[PDB]
Amino acid sequence: KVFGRCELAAAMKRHGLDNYRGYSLGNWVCAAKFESNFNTQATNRNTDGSTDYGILQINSRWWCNDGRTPGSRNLCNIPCSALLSSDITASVNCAKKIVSDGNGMNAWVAWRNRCKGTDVQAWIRGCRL
Ligand SMILES: [Cl-]
Ligand SMILES: [Cl-]
Ligand code: NA
Ligand code: NA
């Protein structure tokens, strides 16, 4: 599924991401835009052999099991394919564990380089929330 901007904002708000660990909703929408272009089916392979999955590009070396990242962990206790569903519940629940692990949203390289320190509230401007 390819979300619309305000559609994803409302879905994320309903799943408890607005101001989760201090990060306003605009941060999460900005991160999804540049990680996946709002596409739940996005995948990308990394040089170390791991793969990133879904709307928030969650990485298989630490967070999900895909059966082909030897020596990796599965800290969210889910198959990586669950992160590609049109239902974002699994992605959101895993993202809450990632952002709580000490490094905040710096875990998402595109957020660090393209959202951090910008006017992120612009990403939810005009949406009915
Ligand atoms: Cl915001
Ligand atoms: Cl933080
Ligand atoms: Na914070
Ligand atoms: Na893994």
Q: Establish whether 35 is a catalytic residue.
A: yes
Query: Cα of 34 to ligand 2 centre, how many Å?
Result: 20
Is 101 a known ligand-binding residue?
yes
If you count them, how many residues does the chain have? Answer: 129
User: Determined by which method?
Assistant: X-ray
**CATH number, position 14:** 1.10.530.10
Distance of alpha carbon 51 from alpha carbon 72, whole angstroms: 11
Q: What resolution (Å)?
A: 1.8
23 Cα–ligand 3 center, Å:
5
**Residue with tokens 């979300």, as numbered in its chain:** 3
3-state helix, strand, coil in the chain (%, to 5): 40, 10, 50
Query: For residue 87, how many other CB atoms are within 10 A of its CB?
Result: 11
Reduced to 3 states (helix: H, G, I; strand: E, B; else coil), residue 76 is coil
Q: Which residues constitute the domain of residue 6?
A: 1-129
Domain count, the chain: 1
